[PDB]
Amino acid sequence: VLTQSPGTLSLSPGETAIISCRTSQYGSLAWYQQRPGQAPRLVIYSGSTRAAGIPDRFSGSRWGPDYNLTISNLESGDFGVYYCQQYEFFGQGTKVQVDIKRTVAAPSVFIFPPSDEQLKSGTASVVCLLNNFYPREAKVQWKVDNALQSGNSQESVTEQDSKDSTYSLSSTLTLSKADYEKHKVYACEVTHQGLRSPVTKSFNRGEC
Amino acid sequence: QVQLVQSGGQMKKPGESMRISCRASGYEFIDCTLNWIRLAPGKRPEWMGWLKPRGGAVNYARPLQGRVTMTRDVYSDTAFLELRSLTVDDTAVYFCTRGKNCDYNWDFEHWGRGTPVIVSSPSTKGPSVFPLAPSSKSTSGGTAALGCLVKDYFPEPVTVSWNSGALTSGVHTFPAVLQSSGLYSLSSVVTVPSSSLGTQTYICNVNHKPSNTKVDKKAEPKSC
Amino acid sequence: VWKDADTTLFCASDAKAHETEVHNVWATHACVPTDPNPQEIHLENVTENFNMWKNNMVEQMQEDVISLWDQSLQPCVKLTGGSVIKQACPKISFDPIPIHYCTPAGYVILKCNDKNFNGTGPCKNVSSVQCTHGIKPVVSTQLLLNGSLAEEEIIIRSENLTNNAKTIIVHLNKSVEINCTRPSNGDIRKAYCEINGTKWNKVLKQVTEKLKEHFNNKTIIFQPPSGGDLEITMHHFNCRGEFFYCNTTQLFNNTCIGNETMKGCNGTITLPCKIKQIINMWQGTGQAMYAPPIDGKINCVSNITGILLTRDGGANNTSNETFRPGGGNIKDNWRSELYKYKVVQIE
Ligand SMILES: *[C@@H]1O[C@H](CO)[C@@H](O[C@@H]2O[C@H](CO)[C@@H](O[C@@H]3O[C@H](CO[C@H]4O[C@H](CO)[C@@H](O)[C@H](O)[C@@H]4O)[C@@H](O)[C@H](O[C@H]4O[C@H](CO)[C@@H](O)[C@H](O)[C@@H]4O)[C@@H]3O)[C@H](O)[C@H]2NC(C)=O)[C@H](O)[C@H]1NC(C)=O
Ligand SMILES: *[C@@H]1O[C@H](CO)[C@@H](O)[C@H](O)[C@H]1NC(C)=O
Ligand SMILES: *[C@@H]1O[C@H](CO)[C@@H](O)[C@H](O)[C@H]1NC(C)=O
Ligand SMILES: *[C@@H]1O[C@H](CO)[C@@H](O)[C@H](O)[C@H]1NC(C)=O
Ligand SMILES: *[C@@H]1O[C@H](CO)[C@@H](O)[C@H](O)[C@H]1NC(C)=O
Ligand SMILES: *[C@@H]1O[C@H](CO)[C@@H](O)[C@H](O)[C@H]1NC(C)=O
Ligand SMILES: *[C@@H]1O[C@H](CO)[C@@H](O)[C@H](O)[C@H]1NC(C)=O
Ligand SMILES: *[C@@H]1O[C@H](CO)[C@@H](O)[C@H](O)[C@H]1NC(C)=O
Ligand SMILES: *[C@@H]1O[C@H](CO)[C@@H](O)[C@H](O)[C@H]1NC(C)=O
Ligand SMILES: *[C@@H]1O[C@H](CO)[C@@H](O)[C@H](O)[C@H]1NC(C)=O
Ligand SMILES: *[C@@H]1O[C@H](CO)[C@@H](O)[C@H](O)[C@H]1NC(C)=O
Ligand SMILES: *[C@@H]1O[C@H](CO)[C@@H](O)[C@H](O)[C@H]1NC(C)=O
Ligand SMILES: OC[C@H]1O[C@@H](O)[C@H](O)[C@@H](O)[C@@H]1O
C-alpha cells in the first residue's frame, strides 16, 4: 500500500531532497532516517509535525494520498536512507547519497550477446553497458523485434568514480534459451540528459 | 529518559532458533506497548509484532506467525523475542521500539541499538563465468568493451581482476544482484582501445573464496 | 451551557450493611444508598461529542474495583518482587453487586441515547442524568459477563479499527448464557462451562457479519490467543471466590460459524475449565496463592453480553481478517458500560 519513491536520490550538500510516499488507507504517516550503522530515528510524525531534536529544515507536506518529506539543506549527516510509515507498514526506502557535481557526460553504450557456453546450459543473458556518464539519471529500455519489454531486466549502477566523478550502469536482460531462439533482433534504447536523441545499440542473433 | 537496552548480536545457521532480549528503563514497563522491527539491507523494514507487558498480550505479524514468540519478565523490565527455524533470509538487524507516547503506538521515537543476526549456510555454490565478447570489427581509433558474467553463486562476495591485476584502468565491477533463484550475479566490464584486441590478451580472474573457487576465462571477440 | 471536565465522582449501591459478602462490605463504607427517583432530563436540540476511550469515568471505577479487591481477596501468600507477604487465607463470600456513579454539585452526566452509537463521535439524542445505571464490577477476559446489551443491533466498538493495537469490544444485542460449574465430588480442581452452541454460533455468525462492512467483505475468521499469561489465553473470571480458567478454543470454531447445516456439532458445548490457586494479580504486579477450592457444587450462571477481540496485522494482500479473544486491560470492562456517559461542568 505504501509506495515510496524515488528508490535512490543523488544530491550535493546544499540542495533540497524531495521524497514522496503515496498511501491509500486511513492512517497517520511518519518518517524515519537511518544513517549507516546507526539505528533509525524519528523525523516527522502525524504528517507534518516535526519530532524532538529535529532541525526546522526537515518538513512534511500532504495532499490527499500523496505525502512529501523534504530536507531544505542537506549536510554531512543528512545523508542516509529514509522510510515512510503507516501503522505497521513501511516503505521500501529512499537512499540519499552524495553526488560530486561535474560537467554533463554522455553514456558510451555497448551491448553483448549471450555466450554459446551459456546457451548450452539453460538460459541466455543479454548485457547492456553504459560506461562513464553523468548525471546518474539514465533510462535503459530493452527492445526485442522492436517490441518494448519490462520485468525481465535488472539494472545495477556503480558508485561514483572518485576520479572523473562518472557513473556506469549494467542492464542485464535474462531470457530462456527456448525463448531466445524465436526472436531475432535484440537492442537496448538508452536515453540520457547528455544525449540529444535516444541511442540504440543492437545485434542480430546468430550472425556476428 | 526512556532507553531500550538490547542484547548482543548473534550468528546462527539455517534450522536453529535465535533468542534476543530488550530491557526498558526510564518509564513504566506495563504502561507502553513494545514492538520488534527487523531491518535488512535492500528490503522494507518489517514489523514483527507488538507485546503488551500488562498480561503478556501479543500480536504477531501474519507472515511470521508460527515461527515467532514474544514474552516478557514484568519485574525484570525485560522483553524477549524468539524466532524458530531460521533461514538465510532472516539475516537482519532486530530492533525493539516504543511509541512516542503510550497513547499512540506507531510513532516509534524510541529504538534500541539493534541486534545484528547473521544466518550463514554451510552450503555454497561456485560461480559460472560466461564471456562477454567485445565484437568482431576492430578500428585503429575506435574503443571497445569486454568483460565477464559471474553468474549463479552463493553467498557473496566474489572478486574479479583482469590479467592477474595487470589491468586496472577502465575496469568496472558492478554490485552483485540477488536473482529470483536465491543466487547472486554480477558483471565486470573493462574498456580498451579496439586496436588492442589483436595485440593484447584479456583474461578475467574470478575468485569466490567461500567455495575455494578460482576461475580464469579468456575473453576474445566472437570468432565469426 | 457547559464544558468537558473531570471531577471526583461518588458511587452508590443497594449494598446490605449486614451482608458478609465482599462487595457489600466495601460499598457499605464507600457508596451511598441508591436514588429511588432517577431524574432523567432529556435535552432538546443538543449534540455533544463522546469519547468512550478518553473518558475519565473509567479511571475512577478502576481505582475503585482495585481498592475493593485489595481489601477483600485474602491470598495465603503474595510474591511481588523480592518480597513475600504471608497472611490468613479464609474463604470469602464473592458476588458482585451493581454500582452506580454519580456527580457532585456543579457537574452533571450527559447520557447518549442513540441506538447504534459506536462509543465515539457526535450524539444527536442526548439526555441528562445524575447517576449511571447499575454497573457490576465483573473482572474477566475474552468474554464480557453480566453487562448490558446493545439497544438496537450488534455494535463493533474500537478507537480505530485500522489500528491493530486498539482492542475491539463487540457489543451483543442478544445475551448468551454461560453455565460454569464444578460438580461436588477425580480432581477437585477441574470444572466446566456449558453454552448453548446452537444459540451461540447463531449470534457469533451475526458478529462476523458486523465485522464485515467495517473490513469490507473480507472473510472474518477467529483464532485462539497467540500467547500471554493464562489469565489472557483463557477465559478468566472469579466465581464464588474461586478463580476459574476456561478453555474457549472450541467456543470460536469457524466451521460452526457457518451453522450446523451439514456439520455435526449441535447441542451444548462444554468448555474445559480449571480452578487455579496460583494466579497473577490483575490489580498490581506479582503472584498470589489461594487455598484449595471449597467442597460442594460451585456454580455460577453468567450472561455473555460482549466479546473482546484483537485483530492480526501484517498482510495487506490477504483476502480476510483474523480475530483473537482479547483482554488484559480491565479498564475496557468498564468502557463497555460507561461508553454512553460523559461528565461536564455547568458554568
Ligand atoms: C511533492 O513534491 C513534488 C515534487 O516537487 C510535487 O509535485 C510537483 O508539484 C509542482 C507544483 O507544486 C509541479 O510543478 C508544475 O510544473 C509545471 C511545469 O512543467 C510543465 O511541463 C511538464 C512536462 O511537459 C508537464 O508535465 C507539466 O504539467 C507542465 O506543463 C508547471 O506548468 C505547473 O504550473 C503550476 O502553477 C501554474 C501557475 O504558476 C499554473 O498555471 C499551472 O496550472 C500549475 O498549477 C507546476 O508549477 C510539478 O509538476 C509536480 N511534479 C510532479 C508531480 O511530477 C508535489 O506537489 C509534492 N506533494 C505534496 C503533497 O506536497
Ligand atoms: C484514529 O486515528 C486517526 C489518525 O490515524 C485519528 O485522526 C482519529 O482521531 C482516530 N480515531 C478516533 C476517533 O480516535
Ligand atoms: C428544535 O428544533 C426542532 C426542529 O429541528 C423543533 O421541532 C423544536 O421545537 C426545537 N426545540 C427547541 C424548542 O429548541
Ligand atoms: C464511530 O462513528 C464515527 C462517526 O460518528 C466514525 O468516525 C468511527 O469510525 C466509528 N467507529 C467505529 C469504527 O465503529
Ligand atoms: C431519544 O431517545 C429516546 C428513547 O431512548 C426517545 O424517546 C426520544 O424521542 C429521543 N429523542 C429525540 C430527540 O428524538
Ligand atoms: C441484533 O443485531 C443484528 C444486526 O446486527 C440483528 O440481525 C439481530 O436480529 C439483532 N438481535 C435482536 C434480538 O434484535
Ligand atoms: C448448569 O448446569 C448444571 C449441570 O452441570 C445444571 O444442573 C443447571 O441447571 C445449569 N444451570 C442453569 C441455570 O441452566
Ligand atoms: C439452544 O437454544 C435454542 C433456541 O431455539 C433452543 O431451541 C434449544 O433448546 C437450546 N439448546 C439446548 C440444548 O439448550
Ligand atoms: C485449550 O485446549 C486446546 C485443545 O482443545 C489446546 O490446544 C490449548 O492449548 C488449550 N488452551 C490453552 C492455551 O490452555
Ligand atoms: C470445529 O468443528 C469441526 C466440526 O465439529 C471439527 O471438525 C473441528 O475439529 C473443529 N475445529 C477446531 C476444534 O479447531
Ligand atoms: C453474573 O450474575 C449472576 C447473578 O446475577 C451470578 O450468579 C454470576 O456469578 C455472575 N457472573 C460473574 C462471575 O460475575
Ligand atoms: C441474563 O439476562 C438476560 C436478559 O438480558 C436474561 O434473559 C437471562 O435470564 C439472564 N440470565 C441469568 C438468569 O443470569
Ligand atoms: O509464569 C508463571 C505463571 O504463568 C501464568 O500464566 C499462570 O497464570 C500463573 O499461575 C503462573 O504463576
Helix (H, G, I), strand (E, B) or coil at C195: strand
* B9 φ/ψ angles, rounded to the nearest 5 degrees: -65, 155
Give the closest residue to A137 by CA, choosing from A17, A4, A9, A14. A9
Alpha-carbon distance B52 to C323, whole Å? 17
Give the residue carrying C-alpha cell 445475551: C175
Contact C315, C214 (CB under 8 A): no
C206: DSSP letter: H
Alpha-carbon distance C239 to C245, whole Å? 10
Output the nine-digit C-alpha cell for A174. 535474462
> CB B28: neighbour CB atoms within 10 A?
10
User: If you count them, how many residues does chain A have?
Assistant: 208
Alpha-carbon distance C312 to C324, whole Å? 8
Contact C146, C75 (CB under 8 A): no
Output the nine-digit C-alpha cell for B92. 537482519
Name the closest residue on chain A to residue C165, using Cα atoms.
Answer: A87
From ligand 12's centre to the CA of C151, what distance in Å?
Answer: 15
Give the closest residue to C231 by CA, choosing from B55, B134, B177. B55
Contact C176, C259 (CB under 8 A): no
User: If you count them, how many residues does chain C have?
Assistant: 347
Alpha-carbon distance C40 to C131, whole Å? 9
Interface contacts (A, C; CB < 8 Å) = 13
Name the closest residue on chain C to residue B51, using Cα atoms.
Answer: C228
Helix (H, G, I), strand (E, B) or coil at C69: helix
Task: Compute CA distances B214 → B83, B147, B161, C182, C187, whole Å.
Answer: 37, 16, 11, 75, 71
Alpha-carbon distance C233 to C229, whole Å? 6
Output the nine-digit C-alpha cell for C161. 479499527
Give the residue carrying C-alpha cell 463497555: C336
The CATH code for residues A107-208 is: 2.60.40.10
Name the closest residue on chain A to residue C312, using Cα atoms.
Answer: A88
Alpha-carbon distance C330 to C336, whole Å? 10
Interface contacts (B, C; CB < 8 Å) = 68
> CB B82: neighbour CB atoms within 10 A?
13
Contact C169, C332 (CB under 8 A): yes
Q: Which amino acid is at C198?
A: T
CA angle A19, A25, A28 (to 5 degrees): 60
Q: Is the omega angle on the peptide bond into residue A135 within 30 degrees of 0, that is, cis?
A: yes
Helix (H, G, I), strand (E, B) or coil at C30: helix
3-state SS, one letter per residue, for chain B: CCEEEECCCEEECCCCCEEEEEEEECCCCCCCCEEEEEECCCCCCEEEEEEECCCCEEEECHHHCCCEEEEEECCCCEEEEEECCCCHHHCEEEEEEEECCCCCCCCEEEEECCEEEEECCCCCECCEECCECCCCCCCCCCEEEEEEEEEEEECCCCEEEECCCCECCCCEECCCEECCCCCEEEEEEEEEEHHHHCCCCCEEEEEEHHHCEEEEEECCCCCC
Question: Which domains, and CATH codes, for chain C?
Answer: 1-347 (2.170.40.20)
User: If you count them, how many residues does chain B have?
Assistant: 224
* C116 φ/ψ angles, rounded to the nearest 5 degrees: -110, 40
> Domain residues of chain A, as ranges?
1-106, 107-208
Find the residues whose C-beta lies inside 6 A of ligand 2.
A 27-28; C 120, 159-160
Tell the residue nearest (CA) to atom 12 of ligand 5: C125
Cβ of residue A25 closer than 8 Å to a chain C Cβ: yes
* A7 φ/ψ angles, rounded to the nearest 5 degrees: -75, -40
Q: Neighbouring chains of B at 3+ CB pairs within 8 Å?
A: A, C
Give the residue carrying C-alpha cell 552524495: A98
CA angle B93, B97, B98 (to 5 degrees): 175
Q: Which amino acid is at B64?
A: L
| A107-208 has the same fold as A1-106 | yes
Give the residue carrying C-alpha cell 522494507: B44
Q: Which amino acid is at C229?
A: D
* Residues 6 or more apart whose Cβ sits within 8 Å of residue B89: B119
Ligand 2 atom nearest A26 alpha carbon: 5
Between C22-30 and C56-70, two packed helices, what is the crossing angle to 10 degrees? Answer: 120
Question: Which domains, and CATH codes, for chain B?
Answer: 1-121 (2.60.40.10), 122-218 (2.60.40.10)
Tell the residue nearest (CA) to atom 11 of ligand 10: C253
Q: Is the CB of A181 under 6 A from ligand 1?
A: no
Q: Is the omega angle on the peptide bond into residue A55 within 30 degrees of 0, that is, cis?
A: no
Q: What is the resolution of this structure in A?
A: 2.7
Alpha-carbon distance C345 to C347, whole Å? 6
CATH H-level, domain A1-106: superfamily: Immunoglobulins (2.60.40.10)
Alpha-carbon distance B68 to C34, whole Å? 52
Q: Is the CB of C96 under 6 A from ligand 11?
A: yes
Contact B39, A82 (CB under 8 A): no
Alpha-carbon distance B205 to B188, whole Å? 10
Collect all residues of chain B within an 8 Å Cβ-Cβ radius of residue A112. 132-133, 147
**C162 and A88 in contact by Cβ < 8 A?**
no
